[PDB]
């Protein structure tokens, strides 16, 4: 919002606790400090003093900190008033603070917003502030913090400076220059691949368990979860609603999706559930097939049920799992039929769940070989796509038409797209939309 | 566990926030100060420095305040660390802190005790302190029942039982070496020890895979079939979750969704409409929903406006009110107001919320959201609760290791019994208390010692 307008916001999560901290920043911070305290303590001093109400009655007691700019989180004069984790007194204090003219509850991201407006840090580091306050896995949290340290900004600045030097080479105008044009491409491709591996643990992937009713997909999902996830019984059509479960096999996220058994039933609800499952199959990154071993010995996908193979689009990895393999006595392990993985295991007994977990871990591109790395965003991937497209078009134009002006224009556009994440060229609308998603008071 | 113990705890409430506070009070305070920050900043100064680990990496960056006694909250060596309100990062930092020898996690409202008995806090509010401790302790006890609630609370049992059995066969032939019990005193004892160790790893590997905790406060929406439960859940979630139809008992399996409200997390629970079940699936789903109801935290009972104008929850369906736990807060959602036309808003009936809303269109949703946030949830939500279990089980494996190492030397059973007793004492913090008299009773019931 308005930079000149002083703002106040609650920092600590709502509820009750030992300390409820209020953060105020703006040009009215000193006047509000006098109004609520009647004095200005030494900056960066943990002073124990009471809080003063408008009528003069003691509002509360705590720790008051005064941080004159620019040696603060935002660079302006910021008052950090820590009291107690009492929401009622916090409400009264916030009302008193808002009473004074010139104060207003800043919109979410304003604390990051203004700090970004003063060029404290890279723009994408602002989003890096998020994705860490609310994570899902320990590995994801560590990667988000490492990114918050600011390595991605280093890589982006190096790439942009190399692109600027190449653009200069154009303006000023060897083979080594082409070798550099290609090795910068190689390093950018490697960093983009690592980023693709990044943000992969922000959601992991989607795996669809597909099979007929009276199969045990509900049971397999239940065993993977390790709790009582769903209802298991011999009644046909055991599950109708789409079931989603977020789990981590080993330091990695993933969403396992259950579905109703594929059969034609007069039930409208069952038909809707089948429709939902067929909708979700395409979105999923991977699909597994569960078929009873006793029902049919066929392992090729066509024999089991020729309809599903035809219906499912190609280019999607698929695996077949032989549930109830204990009754059949089949050797438990990993095999391949028609080029697709085939596992055997029994849900109720739990045998073969470990091999299923190992297959899920290994099949998806990931491993513990590389640590630290980086966590990226969809917008980052789109910007990388556009930059790579521009670079490829520029190189093709050079090779074929030898158009120096066209190559220079393509290189400049690619550099601008790459710097879009840095925010030098990004418009204010994108910054505002990104900052709005942040929680209030951040 | 003297009053001089240095304790580490979290001050900020659980959930999402921009700042997290960890406070340590005790003799080892300075030790922790040097262990985490690798130095001691200026006292009562807003120093700035990131948090480092043993490997040398950074776990968080924030503000550290060091307050030597007696001018502090508890009048002792107090350390305050402020960083980012991330549950995962907070858990990592707490795990880093706890590894130091002689440290332990604080009990419910221990800092109130420390700051009260040191005369650093006023004396008038004795009753207020008496309640502030009890409420936190009760909430902590209520938690940790979700920590040990799945397959994870299936190996530890095994473990403990195995240990008990071993102890029964190791202590007995130290107290009754005059009966005919054919004790296993031969070397095979160590063999029976090995499996116990091999069992513990399994437990330590059980919680490393599965669900993802998903801290928050539980809310349940329930009523009779076709009462708007699906519509209410879909509206609250903001995305389609369950099918919406007029068929009785459309949904048969419980559904769980997660939603944040201005930094306060909440978990919406959908269950099949309550009624008499003529099907195995329906009856089992009704039982599951009923069982989930008791463990819930907040409950919104469906009251269809079309069905009747009754407002009192007891009159609408007294049996559910009677079956409900007394402490369980209850709210009343008069569904289908848009058709009935009853004015939207917030009201009170016999002290319980009564809210008429239009679920089919979204009328009155903001009122329910306002009531939900205004309702409150102290601490001990999830991660910390399971940290206690992962710590108690942690400081038993080393005792078993050191006890087993003894057997390699002269076979002295007294030291083995001491180590096993210490290990079982540590394990008792998870399941329950196992006094010596219980071991004696099991020995009596297992053998024909008699007299
Ligand atoms: N012993 C054993 N039991 C199994 C095996 N596969 C499935 N079951 C049993 O199948 C029973 C019925 O579960 P059910 O509700 O049909 O699961 P479902 O997944 O809903 N069936 P469907 O996959 O067709 O949807 C469970 O109690 C489970 O123990 C197996 O390999 N071994
Ligand atoms: N006219 C009207 N209908 C409503 C309103 N709120 C909910 N409903 C109806 O309530 C019905 C509830 O049935 P359904 O969607 O199956 O969900 P449910 O309430 O969980 N029923 P069940 O327990 O049988 O699964 C919905 O189909 C919806 O049309 C409302 O405000 N007005």
Curated annotation (Swiss-Prot), chain B:
Binding-site positions, Mg(2+): 230, 251
EC number in record: 3.6.-.-
Effect of residue 250 to A: 4-fold decrease in GTPase activity and 1.5-fold increase of affinity
Gene Ontology CC: cytoplasm; cytosol; cytosolic tRNA wobble base thiouridylase complex; plasma membrane
Protein residues bound to GTP: 226-231, 245-251, 270-273, 335-338, 358-360
Domain TrmE-type G stretches: 216-376
Effect of residue 282 to A: 1900-fold decrease in GTPase activity
Activity regulation: GTPase activity is strongly activated by potassium ions.
Enzyme class: hydrolase
Keyword GTP-binding in record: yes
Domain of life of the native organism: Bacteria
Cofactor details (free text): Binds 1 potassium ion per subunit.
SUPFAM superfamilies named in the record: P-loop containing nucleoside triphosphate hydrolases (SSF52540), TrmE connector domain (SSF116878)
Keywords: Cytoplasm, GTP-binding, Hydrolase, Magnesium, Metal-binding, Nucleotide-binding, Potassium, tRNA processing
Single GO MF annotation: protein homodimerization activity
Family assignment from sequence similarity: Belongs to the TRAFAC class TrmE-Era-EngA-EngB-Septin-like GTPase superfamily. TrmE GTPase family.
NCBIfam families, per database record: mnmE_trmE_thdF, PRK05291.1-3, small_GTP
Entry protein name: tRNA modification GTPase MnmE
Source organism per UniProt: Escherichia coli (strain K12)
Gene name linked to the record: mnmE
